[model samples]
Target: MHFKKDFVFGTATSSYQIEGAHNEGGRTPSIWDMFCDIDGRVFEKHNGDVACDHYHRYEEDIQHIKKLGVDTYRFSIAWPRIFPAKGEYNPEGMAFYKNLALRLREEGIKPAVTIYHWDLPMWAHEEGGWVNRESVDWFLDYAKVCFEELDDIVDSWITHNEPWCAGFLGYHVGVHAPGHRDMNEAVRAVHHMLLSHGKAVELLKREMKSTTPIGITLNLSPMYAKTDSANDRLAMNNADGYSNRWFLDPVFKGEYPVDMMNLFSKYVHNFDFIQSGDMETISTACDFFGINFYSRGIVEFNAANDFLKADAYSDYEKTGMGWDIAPNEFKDLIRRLRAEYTDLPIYITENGAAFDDVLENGEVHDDNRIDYVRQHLEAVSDLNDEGMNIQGYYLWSLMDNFEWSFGYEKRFGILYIDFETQERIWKDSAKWYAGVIADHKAKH
Candidate 1:
């Protein structure tokens, strides 16, 4: 068996990660820009002021996408660029996307746009960002601007990418943009993220007449206990509830997990932020679910970690970021999602690995990344063979760029980028992926 006729193969990228020109074309600062201004938040104090220089070279990048033989190309619009400040729209900012999206259509690749990929305009951050309920209206207006302008060009739309990172990693851990270390703020941010996604979907259906699919992307992983010990099992369950179920339940089950909500209520002073009909809006039915899977979570009891009382125990072969390389767990993740949640079509929206890629003799021999993706793609193939509704698979990125807090140090793209030169070098993994895409296309 092979990929079905309707299955999509594509490469993914975000605005801040790829489109530099941070201050050009009427674009204002994003929260990420302000976060990078802080001395020690990002690696080597590096920022995305000028990432891949893709803003001026997007046509060349689109040519690369066409060469990759993929059916779709997933990229994000910079919210800061679209709306430079409160209650404003920038035509110059919209013009760039209009041209890039039209170019993708010319290349025969479907355009999938992510409305918010962690680039909130700085003005919005001052308005309390996701912690403020007003964010739902802000995002709806921002999304409407995109639909008004680019609805005819885009094939699919993603409301948010990895709300877990946006909420927990940004607020609780203080690693991402608009960093805050408040537990209450983290919970508040998560609620607003879900609400924004639901509202975006509802408005898109009402305003956009196109038949494009709209969904939100969640970065999910399977939780595994270190041992059969009851303590470890309980810790793993708690970790799952906080990490997976907390986000999944409201979207699919229409309510927060009772156990998790009860657990979180102990840390939060009040739950007044959650108003009537909030869950109903958050749970509004969607066209599909986009999951970003990298590895499984290994959990063990941690008496010192007060919040969840669980700590991560690293296992399996590791990536450059020390993330466990567990492809089989991805199969388990999709299976569990299908069996337990809605049977809607699933897309691997963002899937790739970061390796210490070195440019030698003008070529990048990233065989490790090739193998990593091959195994994960094999997992998708197996699941699809088992009568699953796996609709598409998108490689995490087409080229390397600024990797959030890690900056340019981590390379997750098949096309190796020289940040200093703005030159993209095709790695061995790129050749490998191109072959995989072509082979699957031939089969169909």
Candidate 2:
């Protein structure tokens, strides 16, 4: 995409991935630890207790990332590792991140830190987590601890990753950890999460050293209606409201779209979570916006399932993860987000698909993944040519680690992890990506 030479490119993973020694770093139980215990909750009940063991293997992992000729590494610190209890900060847990940040800087890769990425430590959840307005302060405290220790090395702080999936999918669809099905709780959790991000950013700017970049990452996508019916169109509109704009509008505009709130009015409270000056706080501009577009969702209307109607999308393209492969839609999504929200710079913070890729005879012929990235990278470049402020693009992952409940079943990596051996495989795609970065850099 001909980004600035200094433009940073990197891959992202949460603690629950690559980081093993999950229990050794004085880490306590996260809601995910408990979720893994439920018989049917996770595929193979694979908890991250000793994932790719990134907690221990970070040194090796960084070397792997550096081979791509990228200058950044993005990850999240485990809050449970820091504060098992609500307010009590563990010094040792703080030491882990401080050390990780230092080591990343030493490796010549900048740390692109994501403060929270769905692994909410159980202690926070016990005290009502995002559902409680008080949770806002707790999250800020977490941010402050990181800023105090690693802000020198980690100038780029992403407040939250994928708030929609965290609130709606985790709470409403019961698909992720802390699984719950209450619509009202989902609505409450939704508002509180955004509120926490705003509070966290304000705390960093006001308390920490000035000139740091603070932002929020939302996994946004453009949607297609399955039919031209008014209800179908409304269904697609509502899906966008719920999946995309509900989070973005609040972050940038400081006001949730009236269309969205009005649609969910019955399920949502009066939004009392927003205090008198809260919108003003949330309205503040960010130095950057992280857009994690994976695949687009198609909306269809069904009146049987709910307050008014239910919606579903076709899993049109079959991958190992059963996700659609409409890479064209991916371009449209980024272009629209840039068009609609032009002031802030955006990053293709994450974009990749999963499939049942196999590493047979010491080589994973992941041509599908190679094609996927090439298509999407072109899409990303297309929008970049359209004058969208996209500076960098990071793939979803480097190696195939334990993928949430799907465990290792869904392989979404350029590098593959032999789940049984814990060995890393630089698949065909990984090599291709490395070459792509190298060729582009040389030309620039």
Candidate 2, 443: how far from true, in Å?
A: 1.6
lDDT (Cα) of model 1? 0.86
Question: Which parts of model 1 have CA positions greater than 4 angstroms off?
Answer: 207-210, 308-312
Overall lDDT per candidate, in order of appearance: 0.86, 0.77
Query: Which tens-of-lDDT digit does each residue in 163-266 have in candidate 1?
Result: 99999889988989887888799999999989988877877787555568888889997889888988888788888887799999999988888777777776
Q: What is candidate 1's TM-score against the reference?
A: 0.97
Q: Clashes in model 1: which pairs?
A: none
> Candidate 2 on 1-444: residue-level lDDT in tens?
555565556777877776778667678888888888877778877878787877666677777887887667788888887777767778886786787788877777778888898889887788776777777778888878777888787858888889888899888888787887777788788777887787777777776645778887888877788778798887778778878888877777778798877766777767776678777777667788888878777777767645234646575765666667888787677667656765678877887888677658888787777787888777666766777767778888877877888887777777888767777667777687788778777865
Q: Once model 1 is optimally superposed onto the true structure by TM-score, how far is the C-alpha of residue 6 displaced, in angstroms?
A: 1.4
What C-alpha lDDT, on a 0 to 100 scale, does residue 19 get in candidate 1? 89
